[PDB]
A paper describes a structure:
RBD, which directly binds to ACE2 receptor, is a major target for development of the therapeutic nAbs against COVID-19. The prefusion structure of S protein exhibits more dynamic conformational changes in S1 region, especially in RBD, which has two distinctive conformations, “up” and “down”.10,11 Only the “up” conformation of RBD can bind to the ACE2 receptor. To further explore the interactions between nAbs and S proteins, we solved cryo-electron microscopy (cryo-EM) structures of the S protein in complex with ten nAbs, in full-length IgG-form or in both IgG-form and Fab-form. Bivalent binding was revealed for the full-length form nAbs, which showed that the full-length form exhibits different binding mode and induces more RBDs to the “up” conformation than the Fab-form that is monovalent.
In pattern 1 that includes P2B-1A10, P5A-3A1, P5A-2G9, P2B-1A1 and P5A-2G7, two “up” RBDs are bound with nAb. The results showed that after 120 min incubation, some nAbs such as P2B-1A10, P5A-1B8, P5A-2G9 and P5A-1B6, induced about 80% shedding of S1 subunit of the S protein. The first group, including P2B-1A10, P5A-3A1, P5A-1B8, P5A-2G9, P5A-1B6, P2B-1A1 and P5A-2G7, has the largest overlap between the epitope and the ACE2-binding site on the RBD. Their epitope residues are distributed across the receptor binding motif (RBM), mainly in the cradle region. Among the 17 RBD residues involved in ACE2 binding, more than half (8 to 15) were recognized by the antibodies in group 1.
Numbering used by the authors:
A (entry chain J), D (entry chain H): 1 to 223
B (entry chain A): 347 to 543
C (entry chain K): 1 to 215
Write the structure that this text describes.
């Protein structure tokens, strides 16, 4: 009953001025020690900034002079006013409350599931989808696998679900791959009893959040 | 009184001016002083006082002030930005408004360029809005430049006629001129006294 | 300030009649009052101004009066070439131009029953994975029509949307389009799609229907 | 011989800086009282701003501090420099000349047919078109109806014509409907003699002006 959602992310060129909106529920953000923590892809975590509940501000000294924190005490939103990038700040950005849990000592005790921020320009692009049909070369005994290939997109956060989120058994989305062309690609596959090749519904729901792409593709055995 | 597009201009001169009979007359709905607060007028002396007179609507009295905009201050009567005098205004519904409409009080509603302060323009050339030349005849984008308040006695306040007088004290570089009265007491005799004659 | 209220909002006009919309105000004005007409879709035009003095292009109808608080706009009838929206404007020395709300009008044409037509979903859309089932009701006076969708004789609630056209300037009728939206999967689970229209010009309701998958 | 066309509109997020270009013909816009008037969907009209022909500017006090008017006296264009929205300004925006038509009194006497401005983000999207075939269930006696269904688009102003604007009889485009998905949809239908089911040309021309979509779809009786 205390999760804060941050609105932002999306791509951008080196030198932009994107700012992020961390909106909280369950507590005042004008009375707590809210803080920002990022972590690079395949790297360790790193502190970014904090604000005290009287107005003071502090920065991580690698991102100082270019970042700004502010809050809306009547809207319960926490702002990371970012500008003048240097194209190493591509990371996932988390919010955290800093609250004491001892007679001596304090801690981060509630987090916000992170939002992706990327930078490099190269514009963006929507995904191209194909269904990878269940086949006897994929079939073995009691089960057979089918999936959806979603390829050639820049704006990293993309999602593919199976049957509007119905099937959770065997559904496995593999990490996206970055081609030489500069665009990402991935494929998500799920196994299902071989007695059930075409029988039930298996429609992959592709949603691209930086763009506004939403397409449902049905996967059926090969002709 | 005088129209708003051809205001009058009286040049008060060497005299004994008593702005107290004005200031306390309580008959004025608006008495603002800008260069100088009102009570200290009967204690100063200038070179010339000018008095301008005209008649406007009721809610147009807020454009007679330094630094305003609107059809009146743009091109009918413009006050400089370092004005010095005072502006006086009072309602005159019973004198100037007549049943059926008093169409003798006009104002200018189109001009090429806003007036310079204290500049006056009584011409009556056909305005030309569009690019097409007008040749002295009316038509689309060729408009007569003067409109008339049709004042009527059953008009809500803010549409009834107000009479306005703008006093402007100026100080060129002469030797002196009009100033306020010289209150005098009584002369006593046969007592060591402190006197000023 | 001054706010003017137009009392009779969207009355009923019969051909060969009269109509008097009525507007009043705050603290009184005098002849600074224009009436406008905006057709359903176009830009507004001016047709009165001052209080009366018709505009050059307006016909012998459309008279106006009143001059101190109350103003009355009057038509020698209700030409089918109306059904527009009529606003009132005032203004003042200081910048400002308060448009009063406005009315509509309407008409009273004879009872006309709708032509009904049902359209199954196109094969292109079933590829995409969704089925729109359109039902059309063509020309009709009383707009108080009911569209009941039925799927295999089950009355369908909460997956349809309607919209209706402006009263037609020629024959003073309405037309209505109801769209039923289903998934491909759910579409393929039933057979008869029916659209049952109820209306005053119909003695008993009309159903147009098709059978999924029958050329 | 005096209609002014305004270039602008299109969608936008809350906080944008879109400005509109009202270009006039038949009169100088540096000698008239041009003014802007908007009206919300399903609401009454509302004055916005005016400029006098000496340079002065006035605003409607609900949109003051955020709006700006300017003109080009050598290009005959009137500019509404708008910025810093608040997402209630979704309206149709009209231009009007303010000209006297009496010995006393003035009026708006020429208008500009309006341009739509919308705000809410949710990006934009192109329409998906299907032909609704003429059928015996639509046929009755002498006439039968056919049409085109254009659905799932955000950028509100969309148009569908019949045969490049040829048929004006029976052609009726119904008001677009706003779905729960957030996208609009509509269907335009026309009746034509039942002797003429497939005989002549009935091609709906779909044009989406915020995007650049132009597609012609033929409607023929069901197979």
């Amino acid at each position: 009953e205390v999760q804060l959602v941050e609105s932002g992310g999306g791509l951008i060129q080196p030198g932009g001025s994107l700012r992020l909106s961390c909106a909280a529920s369950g507590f005042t953000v004008s009375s707590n020690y809210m803080s920002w923590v990022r972590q690079a892809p395949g790297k360790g975590l790193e502190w970014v900034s904090v604000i005290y509940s009287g107005g003071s501000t502090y920065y991580a000294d690698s991102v100082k002079g270019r970042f700004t924190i502010s809050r809306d005490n009547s809207k319960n939103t926490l702002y990371l006013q970012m500008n003048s990038l240097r194209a190493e700040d591509t990371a996932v950005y988390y919010c955290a409350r800093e609250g004491p849990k001892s007679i001596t000592g304090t801690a981060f005790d509630i987090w916000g599931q992170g939002t992706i921020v990327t930078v490099s320009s190269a514009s963006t692009k929507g995904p191209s989808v194909f269904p990878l049909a269940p086949s006897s070369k994929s079939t073995s005994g009691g089960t057979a696998a089918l999936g959806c290939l979603v390829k050639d997109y820049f704006p990293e956060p993309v999602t593919v679900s199976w049957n509007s989120g119905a099937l959770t058994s065997g559904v496995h989305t593999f990490p996206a791959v970055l081609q030489s062309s500069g665009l990402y690609s991935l494929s998500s596959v799920v196994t299902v009893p071989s007695s059930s090749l075409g029988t039930q519904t298996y429609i992959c729901n592709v949603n691209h959040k930086p763009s506004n792409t939403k397409v449902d593709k049905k996967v059926e055995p090969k002709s | 009184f005088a129209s708003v597009y051809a205001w009058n201009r009286k040049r008060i001169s060497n005299c004994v001016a008593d702005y107290s009979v004005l200031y306390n007359s309580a008959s004025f709905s608006t008495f603002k002083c800008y260069g100088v607060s009102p009570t200290k007028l009967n204690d100063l002396c200038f070179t010339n006082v000018y008095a301008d007179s005209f008649v406007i609507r009721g809610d147009e009295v807020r454009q007679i002030a330094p630094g305003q905009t609107g059809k009146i201050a743009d091109y009918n009567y413009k006050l400089p930005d370092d004005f010095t005098g005072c502006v006086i205004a009072w309602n005159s519904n019973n004198l100037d408004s007549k049943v059926g409409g008093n169409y003798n009080y006009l104002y200018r509603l189109f001009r090429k360029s806003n007036l310079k302060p204290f500049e006056r323009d009584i011409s009556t050339e056909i305005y030309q809005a569009g690019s097409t030349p007008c040749n002295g005849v009316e038509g689309f984008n060729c408009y007569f430049p003067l409109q008339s308040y049709g004042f009527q006695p059953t008009n809500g306040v803010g549409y009834q006629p107000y009479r306005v007088v703008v006093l402007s004290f100026e100080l060129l570089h002469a030797p002196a001129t009009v100033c306020g009265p010289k209150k005098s007491t009584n002369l006593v005799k046969n007592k060591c006294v402190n006197f000023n004659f | 300030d001054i706010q003017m209220t137009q009392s009779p909002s969207s009355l009923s006009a019969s051909v060969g009649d009269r109509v008097t919309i009525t507007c009043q105000a705050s603290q009184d004005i005098s002849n600074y009052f224009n009436w406008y007409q905006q057709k359903p879709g176009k830009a507004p035009k001016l047709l009165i101004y001052d209080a009366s003095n018709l505009e050059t292009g307006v016909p012998s109808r459309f008279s106006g009066s009143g001059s101190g608080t109350d103003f009355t706009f009057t038509i020698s009838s209700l030409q089918p070439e109306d059904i527009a929206t009529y606003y009132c404007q005032q203004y003042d020395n200081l910048p400002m131009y308060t448009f009063g709300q406005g009315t509509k009008l309407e008409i009273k044409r004879t009872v006309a029953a709708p032509s009904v037509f049902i359209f199954p979903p196109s094969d292109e859309q079933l590829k995409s994975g969704t089925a729109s089932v359109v039902c059309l009701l063509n020309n009709f006076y009383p707009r108080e029509a009911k569209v009941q969708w039925k799927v295999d004789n089950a009355l369908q609630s909460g997956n349809s949307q309607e919209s209706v056209t402006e009263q037609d300037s020629k024959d003073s009728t309405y037309s209505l389009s109801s769209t039923l939206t289903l998934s491909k999967a759910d579409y393929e689970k039933h057979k008869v799609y029916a659209c049952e229209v109820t209306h005053q010009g119909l003695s008993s309701p009309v159903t147009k229907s098709f059978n999924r998958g029958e050329c």
